[PDB]
Symmetry: D2
Subunit: 249 residues, 4 copies
């Protein structure tokens, strides 16, 4: 039988590209989404047209709260419900916006940025492990975590936390044969919305090709880490950044 993967924030962009690739590799997929319901259903339709009964959606808010654990347990349950097994968890969903030190309340900023980037990945990881072949987890990290954007402190703390989870969980889950790794984009898939001037300025920063990563290039590193070619790899985070993190100010 075919393996199954949960991908969070899989309706659009990088998450969708990862889902599409996992599916092309032979995986059945849970497409988790929060607000992008239409895109998610559309993607599941498209994947099931390709191989019937190989994709479902699963809606969940991944903001921190007292029910987040139940919500993460339900995401993993939903993969067992639809496919009888859960082989891969990809923690991709992420809030991202500035939170300067000097609309939203601070308690809400905390709950969204730390919840999505750190606490949900930990809770999904617990639920993944508890419900348990080549088992692994891939956390979408950030290659720029040690050269942070101005006024992104909560976002940065969450991606830092996610590094620590990758390491702690690689360590603790190894005795169960579950590998835990990360993929760290630099800049990838610019908002088609974003001004051409700013897009170009980001592109000019990148040593390798003066362009952003495609979503597919990020997906490719995910595919490697979950593959049989990465069986001895745990606790490793792979930058997919074209050298961006290496460039001095």
């Amino acid at each position: 039988e075919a393996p199954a993967a949960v991908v969070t924030g899989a309706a659009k962009r990088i998450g969708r590209a990862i889902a599409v690739k996992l599916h092309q590799t032979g995986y059945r997929v849970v497409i988790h989404y929060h607000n992008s319901a239409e895109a998610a259903v559309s993607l599941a339709d498209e994947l099931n047209k390709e191989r019937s009964n190989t994709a479902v959606v699963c809606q969940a808010d991944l903001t921190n709260s007292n029910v987040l654990p139940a919500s993460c347990e339900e995401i993993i349950n939903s993969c067992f419900r639809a496919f009888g097994r859960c082989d891969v968890l990809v923690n991709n969903a992420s809030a991202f916006y500035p939170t300067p030190l000097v609309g939203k309340t601070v308690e809400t900023q905390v709950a969204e940025l730390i919840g999505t980037n750190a606490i949900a990945p930990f809770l999904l990881t617990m639920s993944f492990a508890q419900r348990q072949s080549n088992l692994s987890i891939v956390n979408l990290c950030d290659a720029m975590v040690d050269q942070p954007c101005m006024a992104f402190s909560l976002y940065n703390m969450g991606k830092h936390a996610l590094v620590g989870l990758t390491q702690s969980a690689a360590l603790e889950l190894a005795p169960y044969g579950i590998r835990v790794n990360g993929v760290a984009p630099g800049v990838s898939l610019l908002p088609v919305a974003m001004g051409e001037e700013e897009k170009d300025k980001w592109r000019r920063k990148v040593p390798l090709g003066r362009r952003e990563a495609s979503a597919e290039q990020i997906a490719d590193a995910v595919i490697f880490l979950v593959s049989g070619s990465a069986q001895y790899i745990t606790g490793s985070i792979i930058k997919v950044d074209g050298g961006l993190s290496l460039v001095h100010a």
Copy 2:
């Protein structure tokens, strides 16, 4: 006149050594605490006996919740209320206990305590500290073993990682306001009194420098340096004080 400092978790152990040293250097101090009310009150008394009205206490749970932003703002407000200024913030308070990924606190409470105390409260205190504003600085108590974590301590470790991120992000963001932000990262310091000596010696044996743990005072020494005029160009730096422990392979 004399500068002022807030030290969180300042009633006992490393926080207390930090407050005392800062006090000895001429600072007035806010001794924050949570449960150790007797220790905090006797510490303030000892210090005020030494110099009049140079120490006050401030109780607050730093678990993450909807009220944490107000509690943190009140901590900084207590410094201005007591002393008319707030020059230094030392984020030392920390919940520490295992949270296994696989098997009576609920996990959402463990999350709130471990990520609140170690990361979120630091961020909120930093916000209030900066908002309320010379040698201004913040020192965050980190952990030298953060990239070789203890088994079954994922939330604690996540909290300490997040705190490294905060140190960096805040150093960058507050640099234009002349606030430096640095870290001190102990390895093993002041082992629990309750821990058998024979258990303490298994930690001691791992330390290359002297086969022993750090004193509370040695940790405080790094804090005093970071807050001094000898460190005026230092920001975003995390100084390990671990006697080589983090260098030792398994």
Copy 3:
């Protein structure tokens, strides 16, 4: 045309697996060796048996000296002369032995350890860049670089310098389309001079499976990095260590 690769220290062990696996993937290979002449030549025979005119040998000492630049230049030249092109360089050759701070002279130890692990990599990189598709370099690093073996200061210095090179060369060669990455093993192929209690000691520290990596698992990561699935990856070092680097003392 089939692409071509140079693997240093390729007669035995991990270099051999890398050569074999590159060859299996379609590459023509230069098998560099220092003292293992008989194994290099039988490896070449075996690969040419499989596909004719796809493997040659090149002997060189990679110790640091006044002639090291010309040696490295001639290694790269072997590949151009045999195969008309050089697409991949793998810097795998490495001296490794204790050099206590408190037999060989210390200057010899410096030359061997720093030469094999860093300066030869640097010169080979220069020669490779200068002679110039999917071009890349893969440096064999060490996952335990920040928790070094006692009394191994020069080896560790050399491996640190190799991280340095990986990073600097990634930045500098990105404009030419040359990627530069690293693979950092933990423990792999324990020596035979090693006792049973000693090997068991190492194996027991490895979280993922309580075992060393196979040479093939290390090679899997090299193949990935040189592949089209790593087109956006430069300056990245992938640990392949079963989580050994994460284990506190």
Copy 4:
């Protein structure tokens, strides 16, 4: 009696600032130098004017070669010769210049100077320091806060500084049982070259979050002094950035 320190490359700039501050704190100093003879002798002169028989100069090339081990042994021997003891070693001397991968110094010579001064000489001086030994023995290596965002075409320089990080770590671990601490100070930008144009200096200064200015020599020396002092007795294997936040800035 007064402790003694060796400072490599101490005739001017950061090394002089370090030697000056150790001396003021009470140390006897070996001022090592390579080309700057006049500057070194003149510094020793001042320091001796301040306290008699507390400074000496010591000439050595720290380019890698087969005699470098003897040269490093002689540097340390010179401390014992003049002062009867050697408590502190500061590895400050450093060659710095580009070595582009793609294209009148030969590459041999580039490898020798950059890797010699930044790494191999520090290793050999550390060996000789430990070998020649209530004390406070330590080593401070001058590292580089930008070691993971290297300058274009500085590969040999960067390799050398990376190797120095490794030495700092390896030596801390190995020399701990002897009571010898080993730490690093990692400047960002400090003391801009003399002839650099106002335009270029401005561009560097504007990159620094804390104050938009390079570090003073004294600022770097402050961190060295901290690490050698009794306030750092449990500190080993640590590298303190003194960079005004520079290393945290993305491009």
